[PDB]
Amino acid sequence: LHMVKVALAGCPNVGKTSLFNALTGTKQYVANWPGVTVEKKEGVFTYKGYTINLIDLPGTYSLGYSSIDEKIARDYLLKGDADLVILVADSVNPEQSLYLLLEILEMEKKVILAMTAIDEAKKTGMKIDRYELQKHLGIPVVFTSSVTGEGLEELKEKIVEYAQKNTILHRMILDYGEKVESEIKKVENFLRDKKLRINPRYFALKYLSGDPEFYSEGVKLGLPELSEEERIGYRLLIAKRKREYVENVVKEAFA
Ligand SMILES: Nc1nc2c(ncn2[C@@H]2O[C@H](COP(=O)(O)OP(=O)(O)O)[C@@H](O)[C@H]2O)c(=O)[nH]1
Numbered sequence: 001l002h003m004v005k006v007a008l009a010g011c012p013n014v015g016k017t018s019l020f021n022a023l024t025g026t027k028q029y030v031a032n033w034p035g036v037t038v039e040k041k042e043g044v045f046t047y048k049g050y051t052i053n054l055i056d057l058p059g060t061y062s063l064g065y066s067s068i069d070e071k072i073a074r075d076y077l078l079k080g081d082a083d084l085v086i087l088v089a090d091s092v093n094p095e096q097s098l099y100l101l102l103e104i105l106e107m108e109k110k111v112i113l114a115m116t117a118i119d120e121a122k123k124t125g126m127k128i129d130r131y132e133l134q135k136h137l138g139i140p141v142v143f144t145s146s147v148t149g150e151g152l153e154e155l156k157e158k159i160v161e162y163a164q165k166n167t168i169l170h171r172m173i174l175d176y177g178e179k180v181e182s183e184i185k186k187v188e189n190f191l192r193d194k195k196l197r198i199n200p201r202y203f204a205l206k207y208l209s210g211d212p213e214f215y216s217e218g219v220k221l222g223l224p225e226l227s228e229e230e231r232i233g234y235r236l237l238i239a240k241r242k243r244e245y246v247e248n249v250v251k252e253a254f255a
C-alpha cells in the first residue's frame with residue numbers, strides 16, 4: 001500500500017469527529033494511547049491509489065503541557081509519525097482554531113487548514129475569502145462540510161498532493177518584537193550544536209515561556225533558569241502577538 005499518515009488536530013467541538021467519519025466511514029477503530037487509558041481513534045480510506053491513515057487527536061484549545069489531552073496531542077505532533085496534519089477549524093467560530101493553528105505552524109510540520117461546517121457558515125451570510133487565508137497562513141486551505149460533502153474530495157486531493165511535496169509550503173515567522181526575537185536568536189545560537197528533534201525557534205519560544213517540558217529540557221541542555229516573572233512575561237507577549245495576528249487574519253479574510 002501507498003501510505004499517508006494524517007493527524008486531525010483541532011479545538012473541542014469544531015467538527016473533527018464529523019470530518020473523521022465523513023472521510024473514513026465504518027473503517028475506524030479505537031484503542032488507547034500508550035501508557036494511558038485515554039482513547040485513541042484511527043481510521044483509513046483510499047484515494048487515487050493511496051491509503052490514508054487518519055488519526056484523531058484529542059481536542060485541544062492550545063498546545064501546552066499541563067493536561068493529559070494536550071500532552072497526548074502535542075507529543076504526537078512533535079514526536080509521532082504523521083506525514084501531515086489537518087487542522088480542523090470551525091468556520092463559524094474561527095478565532096481559537098486559528099490560534100491553535102499558529103502554534104502548530106511554528107512546529108514546521110505540513111499542515112492543511114480544513115475550514116469545516118462551511119454549510120453553516122454560508123447560512124449566516126458571512127463571507128470567507130479562501131485566498132486571504134492562504135496568503136496570511138501560507139498553507140493549503142479547503143472549505144469542507146460533513147453535512148453536504150462539500151470539499152471532501154478536494155481535501156483528499158490536497159492530502160495526497162501535499163504529502164508528495166519534499167518540504168513544507170508554509171514557514172510561519174511571527175515577529176514577536178526586538179526583545180523576544182533577540183532572546184530567541186541567543187537561544188538558537190546556544191543550541192546550534194545540539195541535535196534537537198524540533199526546530200530551534202519553536203524550542204526557544206517554549207523554553208522562554210516556561211513550558212513544563214521545554215523549559216525543563218532547556219535547562220538540562222545548559223540554558224539558564226528563568227525567573228517566574230520572565231517566563232510569564234514571555235508567555236504573555238507570545239500569546240498576545242499570536243492573538244493579534246489571528247484578529248488581523250479574521251479582519252482580512254472574513255466579512
Ligand atoms: N452544519 C454542520 N455541522 C457540523 C459539521 N461538522 C460538525 N458539525 C456539528 O458540529 C457539532 C460538533 O461536531 P463534532 O464533529 O462532534 O465535533 P468535535 O467535538 O470536534 O469532534 C455537532 O453538532 C455536529 O453536528 C458540518 O460540516 N456542518
Ligand SMILES: [Mg+2]
Pocket residue numbers: 012013014017
Ligand atoms: Mg466533541
Ligand SMILES: [Mg+2]
Pocket residue numbers: 013014090092117
Ligand atoms: Mg460549530
